[PDB]
Each structure stands twice: as C-alpha cells, then as structure tokens.
A = this chain, B = another copy of it.
Amino acid sequence: FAEXVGSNKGAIIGL
C-alpha cells in the first residue's frame, strides 16, 4: 500500500 505517492500530510495506515 502507498505505492506510486506525491505528497502526504495526513495518515495512510495499513493494519
């Protein structure tokens, strides 16, 4: 997950 990702200012969470 989170695969290209330009800009992240938030949360990207895989559980």
Contacts and interface: CB of A to CB of B under 8 A. Distances in A.
Interface of A: 1-15
A4 B5 contact: yes
A8 B2 CA distance: 11
Contacts of A11: 10-13, 15
12 contacts: A3-B3, A3-B4, A5-B6, A7-B8, A7-B9, A9-B9, A10-B10, A11-B12, A11-B13, A11-B15, A13-B14, A13-B15
A12 to B, nearest CB: 5
A10 to B, nearest CB: 5
A15 B12 contact: no
Nearest to A3: B3
